[PDB]
């Protein structure tokens, strides 16, 4: 019966900047609130216990305060390493124990243009009936980018899927994959296969392409 | 160091049973209270259970009370979660955690967590992944992990020897109902590159050398 409201849900700030997450409780919970860090695939990590106290091995960069219904968590002087999800936990008791919705923290970076790569479908895959063409956008910022598929200079609609990595711990960039999915009979019908990339870090659109059965 | 590794995740039929195990390394397991937490996709963490250090006293949240049972074997340094009569709402990454008590303030936190284990509830059948090489004509190469069910799929390069440059993408749910992801690496140019794919729900371990 203790709901916790965490704000903001998203957050983007530069390195060296100070930033503060807020958590609010529906009941007086004294100081029994803890703050956790979570990076994708990794184990969650305890930073601050009981409102204000640092756990050992946690840098001074992290900070906490408040009591009762209102609580705050501050990261002073943000680092590329801090690209994570931060969530709070109310621990007044095991019966009421609950968690905040979390805050996704992005590190704001200077605009970086992607390296573009294209991959033909393997011989192994073609022999099974399907053909997948993969486009890769390497280490770029920000997340927003436009990728389109052209087969003999014809736009492809609804037959591809994109995927984005989480933010990089070191250079704060993203990487994206686009995948055009064709049947073998459709794939062998046309010759030229192209991936055209648009991004705010590119003054000109980038096209990576190949001819069918030439490399 | 102080560590928790989780096992037993996979695919279960609606109403079926599954046992989760949480192994403790680097610390004195028997001294600590242990917890179970879970997180549904697109949702917040949800607290499930507590178990005493001697292991004879448990708490279970209302959402799982007469359904899941926490137990522990201290001589094996293992925490258990017996799950029965499962629903769609039980689809989550499951986390075990170590309790800490701070005497100076009379308070508690979860100071050590596991990396999590995923449980999928569905009446669909298990399917192993097909792994395909991704080759070019700074250079980039990779693996296409296509048509598996359910999640997750873990990918490494050269048995862990190659990490910098690697980008393993989140899976996409295809219109077929099966999952698919790619793993790539960017290496400028005897020295081969082998991706290692692990899909535990189907006990499938595929290695693929790219050339």
């Amino acid at each position: 019966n203790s709901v916790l409201t965490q704000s903001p849900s998203s957050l983007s700030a530069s390195v060296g900047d100070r930033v503060t997450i807020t958590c609010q409780a529906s009941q007086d919970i004294s100081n029994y609130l803890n703050w956790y860090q979570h990076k994708p695939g990794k184990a969650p990590k305890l930073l601050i216990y009981t409102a204000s106290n640092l756990e050992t091995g946690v840098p001074s960069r992290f900070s906490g305060g408040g009591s009762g219904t209102h609580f705050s968590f501050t990261i002073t002087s943000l680092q590329p390493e801090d690209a994570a999800t931060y969530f709070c936990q109310q621990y007044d008791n095991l019966g009421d124990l609950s968690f905040g919705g979390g805050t996704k923290v992005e590190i704001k970076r200077t605009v970086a243009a992607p390296s573009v790569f294209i991959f033909p479908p393997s011989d192994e895959q073609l022999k099974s009936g399907t053909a997948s063409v993969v486009c890769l956008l390497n280490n770029f910022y920000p997340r927003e980018a436009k990728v389109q598929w052209k087969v003999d200079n014809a736009l492809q609609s609804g037959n591809s899927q994109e995927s984005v990595t989480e933010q990089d711990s070191k250079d704060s960039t993203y990487s994206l994959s686009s995948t055009l999915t064709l049947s073998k009979a459709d794939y062998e019908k046309h010759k030229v296969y192209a991936c055209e990339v648009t991004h705010q870090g590119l003054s000109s659109p980038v096209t990576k392409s190949f001819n069918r059965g030439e490399c | 160091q102080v560590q928790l590794v989780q096992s037993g995740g996979g695919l279960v039929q609606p109403g079926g049973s599954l046992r989760l195990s949480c192994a403790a390394f680097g610390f004195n397991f028997s001294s600590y209270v242990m917890h179970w937490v879970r997180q549904a996709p697109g949702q917040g963490l949800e607290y499930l259970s507590a178990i005493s250090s001697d292991g004879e006293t448990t708490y279970h949240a209302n959402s799982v009370k007469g359904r899941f049972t926490s137990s522990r074997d201290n001589s094996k340094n293992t925490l258990f979660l017996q799950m029965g009569s499962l629903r769609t709402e039980d689809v989550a990454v499951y986390y075990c955690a170590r309790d800490r008590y701070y005497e100076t303030s009379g308070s508690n936190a979860f100071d050590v967590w596991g990396q999590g284990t995923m449980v999928v509830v569905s009446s669909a059948s298990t399917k192993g992944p097909s792994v395909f090489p991704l080759a070019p004509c700074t250079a980039a190469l990779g693996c296409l992990v296509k048509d598996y069910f359910p999640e997750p799929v873990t990918v490494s390069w050269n048995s862990g020897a190659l990490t910098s440059g690697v980008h393993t993408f989140p899976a996409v749910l295809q219109s077929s109902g099966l999952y698919s992801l790619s793993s790539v690496v960017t290496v400028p140019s005897t020295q081969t590159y082998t991706c290692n794919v692990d899909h535990k729900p189907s006990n499938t371990k595929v290695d693929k050398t790219v050339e």
Partner: peptide, 15 residues
């Protein structure tokens, strides 16, 4: 209206 302890401190639930 009793507190049942799993462990030390806040590791309890009320019944």
């Amino acid at each position: 209206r009793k507190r049942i302890h799993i462990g030390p401190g806040r590791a309890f639930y009320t019944t």
